[PDB]
Amino acid sequence: TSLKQAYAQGFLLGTAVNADIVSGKDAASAALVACHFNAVTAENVMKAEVVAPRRGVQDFSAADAFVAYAQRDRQFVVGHTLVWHNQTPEWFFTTADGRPNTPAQQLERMRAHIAAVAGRYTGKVQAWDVVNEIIDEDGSYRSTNWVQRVGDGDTVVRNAFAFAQRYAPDAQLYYNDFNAWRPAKREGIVRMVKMLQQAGVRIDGVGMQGHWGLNYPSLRDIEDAIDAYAALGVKVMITELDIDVLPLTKEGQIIGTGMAHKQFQLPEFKRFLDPYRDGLPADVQAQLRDRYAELFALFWRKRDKIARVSVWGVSDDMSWKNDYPVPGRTNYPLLFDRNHQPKPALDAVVAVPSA
Amino acid sequence: TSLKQAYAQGFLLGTAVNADIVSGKDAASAALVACHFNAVTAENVMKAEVVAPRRGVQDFSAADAFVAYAQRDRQFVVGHTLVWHNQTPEWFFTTADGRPNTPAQQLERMRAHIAAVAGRYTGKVQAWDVVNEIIDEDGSYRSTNWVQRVGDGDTVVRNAFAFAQRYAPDAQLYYNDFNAWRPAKREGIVRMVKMLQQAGVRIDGVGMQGHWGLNYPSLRDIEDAIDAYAALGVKVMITELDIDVLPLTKEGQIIGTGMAHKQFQLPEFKRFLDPYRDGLPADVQAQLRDRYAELFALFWRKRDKIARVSVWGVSDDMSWKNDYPVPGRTNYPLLFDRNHQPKPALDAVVAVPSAT
Numbered sequence: 001t002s003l004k005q006a007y008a009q010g011f012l013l014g015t016a017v018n019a020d021i022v023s024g025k026d027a028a029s030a031a032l033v034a035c036h037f038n039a040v041t042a043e044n045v046m047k048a049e050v051v052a053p054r055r056g057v058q059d060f061s062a063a064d065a066f067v068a069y070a071q072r073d074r075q076f077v078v079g080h081t082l083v084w085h086n087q088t089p090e091w092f093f094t095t096a097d098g099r100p101n102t103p104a105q106q107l108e109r110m111r112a113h114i115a116a117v118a119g120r121y122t123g124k125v126q127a128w129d130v131v132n133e134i135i136d137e138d139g140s141y142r143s144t145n146w147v148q149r150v151g152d153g154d155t156v157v158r159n160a161f162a163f164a165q166r167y168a169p170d171a172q173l174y175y176n177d178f179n180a181w182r183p184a185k186r187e188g189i190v191r192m193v194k195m196l197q198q199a200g201v202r203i204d205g206v207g208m209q210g211h212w213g214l215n216y217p218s219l220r221d222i223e224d225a226i227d228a229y230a231a232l233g234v235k236v237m238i239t240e241l242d243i244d245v246l247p248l249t250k251e252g253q254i255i256g257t258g259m260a261h262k263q264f265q266l267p268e269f270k271r272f273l274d275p276y277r278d279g280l281p282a283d284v285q286a287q288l289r290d291r292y293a294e295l296f297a298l299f300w301r302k303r304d305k306i307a308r309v310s311v312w313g314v315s316d317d318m319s320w321k322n323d324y325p326v327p328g329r330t331n332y333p334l335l336f337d338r339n340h341q342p343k344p345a346l347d348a349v350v351a352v353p354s355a
Numbered sequence: 356t357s358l359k360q361a362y363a364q365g366f367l368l369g370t371a372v373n374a375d376i377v378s379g380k381d382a383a384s385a386a387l388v389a390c391h392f393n394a395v396t397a398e399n400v401m402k403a404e405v406v407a408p409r410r411g412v413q414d415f416s417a418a419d420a421f422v423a424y425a426q427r428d429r430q431f432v433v434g435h436t437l438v439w440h441n442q443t444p445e446w447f448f449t450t451a452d453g454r455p456n457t458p459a460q461q462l463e464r465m466r467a468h469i470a471a472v473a474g475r476y477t478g479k480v481q482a483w484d485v486v487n488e489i490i491d492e493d494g495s496y497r498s499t500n501w502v503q504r505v506g507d508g509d510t511v512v513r514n515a516f517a518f519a520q521r522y523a524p525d526a527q528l529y530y531n532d533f534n535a536w537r538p539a540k541r542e543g544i545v546r547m548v549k550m551l552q553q554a555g556v557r558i559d560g561v562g563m564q565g566h567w568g569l570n571y572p573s574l575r576d577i578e579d580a581i582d583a584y585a586a587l588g589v590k591v592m593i594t595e596l597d598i599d600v601l602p603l604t605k606e607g608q609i610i611g612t613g614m615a616h617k618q619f620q621l622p623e624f625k626r627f628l629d630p631y632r633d634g635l636p637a638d639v640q641a642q643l644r645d646r647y648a649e650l651f652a653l654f655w656r657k658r659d660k661i662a663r664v665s666v667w668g669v670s671d672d673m674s675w676k677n678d679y680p681v682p683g684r685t686n687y688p689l690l691f692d693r694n695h696q697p698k699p700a701l702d703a704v705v706a707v708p709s710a711t
Contacts, residue, residue: 137617137618137621215623215627216623217623248603248627251623251624251626251627252618252621252623252624252627254618255618256616256618258611258613258614258616259613261611261613262492263492263607263609263610263611266492266537266607268570268571268572268606268607269606269607272570272606272607
């Protein structure tokens with residue numbers, strides 16, 4: 001009957017929560033969270049640009065509210081995220097005098113931030129996304145702000161997990177990335193985890209972001225990924241699951257701000273890229289059902305290798321996929337609709353465990 | 356029967372020719388040009404970066420070849436682009452000592468360039484795209500390198516067409532743009548033409564580029580566009596016609612370098628964006644045939660207000676739409692295939708003026 005109850009024997013079944021769920025303002029959603037989920041990940045309020053926006057300033061207010069909220073409702077608290085190239089202010093990568101950070105100054109900035117964030121929520125937050133999205137599509141390290149300023153991809157990852165181990169020794173430490181099903185990217189993640197383990201550094205599991213669609217990815221890629229990770233003696237998790245149903249975006253995951261271009265808001269593109277403003281049609285609503293069904297059928301079959309599955313939101317209006325990568329669209333990615341009612345996709349998902 | 360022959364009593368029927376058709380290397384295309392087309396536009400060799408690559412340097416050799424090429428069949432010679440924000444080197448907009456040009460210094464660079472290009476081809480070039488793409492989608496002037504350096508949008512167009520009139524008095528002067536079917540942009544062009552007419556500056560025609568697709572734009576928007584430009588007393592032309600048949604880009608025209616991102620080369624996107632890597636399926640060929648048919652039917656119904664319909668190439672294999680907006684794709688935009696055979700669309704286009 002309930003998502004967390006039906007999947008109780010398999011894995012934790014969680015969701016992302018925004019400020020409005022945590023504040024109580026979104027009453028309808030917060031009610032669904034307590035009913036259906038046993039893990040919460042703070043959508044945004046734990047990122048570095050909210051936590052330490054400028055030099056000399058801190059803001060833990062919203063994150064403190066999130067942690068307290070989860071404990072109150074008995075949730076498996078997941079912090080997200082400690083070290084990430086996006087949503088991290090310019091001052092993290094420069095000295096007070098404007099100079100780009102030396103390898104030592106960059107790691108000190110990493111150490112201090114982890115100690116500030118993870119060290120604050122010891123015993124309260126159970127799991128940390130330590131490094132988020134550092135591997136490229138070819139499997140190598142991404143030339144990101146962190147990687148450039150430190151100077152070595154292996155060094156960035158290795159230190160972040162060691163700092164998290166020091167300042168939150170109680171907490172599980174996860175690597176989290178998108179397109180973790182891609183063979184070339186997968187082999188890179190394995191490589192990185194294997195260097196962490198032989199270094200003696202702690203890492204509890206790899207999180208597959210699961211930001212997928214109707215026509216991607218293949219179950220082969222997903223299964224082969226879950227296998228490849230579990231074989232390294234670490235947990236596997238689907239951490240931010242949603243199913244994009246709109247044109248173009250259902251075909252593959254898009255990054256960057258190219259789709260945010262002014263030109264795609266023009267009528268001819270508006271009328272193609274956002275075709276479901278009046279509502280989701282019977283057949284596409286059925287597709288979304290079948291797609292969720294086959295994926296959870298996979299997760300439940302592989303239940304021994306998966307510690308947690310989380311949807312990146314409760315109701316469709318909450319979703320980041322309405323305004324990303326194309327602002328102003330009406331997407332239908334999650335398991336509950338805009339009236340907070342169950343979607344025919346949910347009924348299938350709850351059926352999977354007993355099926 | 357040929358295109359020019361069928362469309363003789365309606366408008367000139369032209370094509371874009373590359374350096375290869377001109378050099379005689381692409382002889383297969385060359386023969387089709389001599390066969391079907393009575394007007395020609397150089398695809399690239401007359402643009403700024405070619406004819407004036409560096410400060411104090413000129414390369415008119417490849418353009419010279421294009422004009423000489425156009426003599427053997429006596430085509431209507433269209434010079435492609437005098438003032439345009441793209442394919443124009445950054446030295447055009449700066450002094451020798453690095454500083455950005457003053458309004459007066461930028462207008463001089465315009466004058467000296469036009470004199471060198473348009474003045475060089477008097478009696479030989481019949482028409483000029485004087486200004487290419489200056490109006491934005493909302494109708495206002497684009498904040499281009501020319502516009503910023505001159506300081507004002509109206510001054511760019513006013514001077515460009517004035518200098519063109521001076522150094523090429525014989526030539527017909529056009530404004531050329533994409534999306535020229537869009538109401539907001541249409542009004543911006545109409546506004547711009549009116550301003551030129553009130554200032555007594557010469558302008559002869561509005562060219563709708565016509566880089567279109569299967570799902571865009573509506574015949575109505577095209578028709579309202581033709582009507583509006585004709586009521587100004589100028590000539591209307593379809594200047595760079597092609598029909599995009601591949602996903603996403605059959606829905607609307609894309610500009611910029613967004614789709615040049617590594618991510619659209621990844622297997623899941625190439626799968627979606629490039630589905631016809633071994634010929635067009637039957638259902639889509641007919642869709643292209645039907646698209647070209649209904650469009651040329653419009654042009655022919657509105658032939659009195661139209662002066663020229665130019666397709667932007669001969670055979671698909673050299674079409675810019677293959678590598679733009681997404682590189683490494685196989686597109687089918689034109690009227691002849693990669694073996695220079697007539698595509699079903701050609702026969703539909705040729706039949707249009709005879710159709711009952």
